[PDB]
From a paper:
In Caulobacter, the DivK phosphorylation state provides the basis for a regulatory switch that underlies divergent cell-fates upon cell division. This switch is achieved through the activity of the pseudokinase [name], which activates the CckA-ChpT-CtrA phosphorelay pathway in the uncomplexed state and inhibits this phosphorelay when bound to DivK∼P. [name] has a predicted domain architecture that is typical of many HKs, consisting of multiple PAS domains fused to a C-terminal HK module that contains dimerization and histidine phosphotransfer (DHp) and catalytic and ATP-binding (CA) domains. In contrast to typical HKs, a conserved tyrosine (Tyr550) appears in place of the predicted phosphorylatable histidine throughout [name] homologs in α-proteobacteria, with the exception of the Magnetospirillum magneticum [name] that contains a non-phosphorylatable alanine. From these studies, we propose that the [name] pseudokinase has repurposed its catalytic HK fold to function primarily as a sensory module for a phosphorylated RR.
To define the structural basis for the phosphorylation-dependent binding of DivK to [name], we determined the crystal structure of [name]'s HK region (residues 523–769) by the multiple-wavelength anomalous diffraction (MAD) method using a gold derivative. The asymmetric unit contains a [name] dimer, which is consistent with size exclusion chromatography showing dimeric [name] in solution (observed MW = 50±15 kDa, predicted dimer MW = 47.3 kDa). Each [name] monomer ([name]-A and [name]-B) consists of a DHp domain with two helices, α1 and α2 (residue range 526–608; since the α1–α2 loop is disordered in the crystal structure we assigned the connectivity of the two DHp helices in each monomer as in other class I HKs), and a C-terminal CA domain with a highly conserved fold (residue range 609–758). The functionally important residue Tyr550 (colored in yellow in Figure 3A and 3B) is located at the middle of the first DHp helix (α1). The CA domains of the [name] dimer are almost identical (RMSD of 0.64 Å for 144 Cα atoms). However, the DHp domains display significant structural differences (RMSD of 3.4 Å for 80 Cα atoms), indicating that the [name] dimer is asymmetric. The structural movements produce an additional contact interface between DHp and CA in [name]-A, resulting in an increase in the buried surface area (1,730 Å2 total) compared to that of [name]-B (1,400 Å2 total). Structural analysis of the crystallized [name] conformation shows that both nucleotide-binding sites are either inaccessible or too small to accommodate ATP.
Residue numbers in the entry:
A (entry chain A): 526 to 570, 573 to 758
B (entry chain B): 526 to 570, 573 to 714, 719 to 756
Amino acid sequence: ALADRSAALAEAERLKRDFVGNVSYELRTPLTTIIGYSELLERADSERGRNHVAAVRAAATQLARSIDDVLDMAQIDAGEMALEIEDIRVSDLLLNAQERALKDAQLGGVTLAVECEEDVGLIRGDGKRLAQTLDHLVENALRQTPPGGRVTLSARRALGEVRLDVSDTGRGVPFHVQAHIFDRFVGRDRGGPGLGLALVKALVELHGGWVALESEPGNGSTFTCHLPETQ
Amino acid sequence: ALADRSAALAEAERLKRDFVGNVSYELRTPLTTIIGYSELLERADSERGRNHVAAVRAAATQLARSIDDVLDMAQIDAGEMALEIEDIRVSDLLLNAQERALKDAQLGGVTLAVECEEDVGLIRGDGKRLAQTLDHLVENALRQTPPGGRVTLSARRALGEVRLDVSDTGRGVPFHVQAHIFDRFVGGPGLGLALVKALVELHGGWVALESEPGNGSTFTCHLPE
């Protein structure tokens, strides 16, 4: 029918326009920061200059992650992402995520901590995909945490699983967005995670696991990756 | 009701794949360059630092232009770009493109010339989109022209049409790539010439390349009266 064919085309257009509009927002927002701060560098003779460079590098790195997220999410949606399962030492995985984010943490005046015991040992998964999962959770945490705050990376082997936690002393997730926190391009007041948290969920779920958010506006936030043991 | 809705979503997911592909292919080289040179400036005490800034600035401006191209190309592919037809004085259009590119021309040691007769007069079209078309052609010309060379912006009203030419005394395009010169990523930025073709074709026109390998290159916009 005429009305059914019209409604179908309208729905296909709305779903495309929203996707392009969401990806577009993620391209143009870090870009404004890169232009603004690189122009200040051009007209500079230093500590002030260093802060300008750091702001350029952080915005450029965030733009790069958004593009990688769009590509990795499309690969997952097509069912084209297969994991390369191998032995992963959790201790190193946590310390590598801490050193990769250390510069962006000092720029935001935040302390990155690692609280992992020697008894956590080795898990079996995809190193690249688990490193990318932690990276998304740490940068999400740094964006929410104010200067003087703390972001903690912890791991624990208990109840037939390994759980990776990324705690922050930031602003908590308001109740209404807590149910949609792992949805693509979910509207956040402090700053948008884009495809970052949807990717965390998809990557952990590809490992046979699941993700959770424990939050309270005045008591920070905790993101947990529950990874079951393979007997 | 089910087959029509499915075919519509399949077509929209075809558009998505192209957009996502363009985003990845066009933006990642300037981005990596900004990150690498920024990392050097972060761990630096200067003459060397000024070269790092210049590299960050060139990559930043190329990132801005590439993001515009990727977004404009997606809008065109979806059929969501409608032109705002109005009276355009060709003489001003050519001088506007010359003054916007004048700085990048002097940086590359190239001479930017305008050869338009006041007999060309006025044309009908979208001023923003025609200015953007000339900008892409001048950019393309400046990238091909060596220092000491010349890039010319000309216009001519002949045989029931107006033709805008952007000539260059650069390397010249080889005959085998001449037929595919307006194809996306046929070779830096790869949507510029595909955008020129799409914008001129939206104006009811067509584009052409006149090039001799060694002599030069000329890009013409044929806009019918």
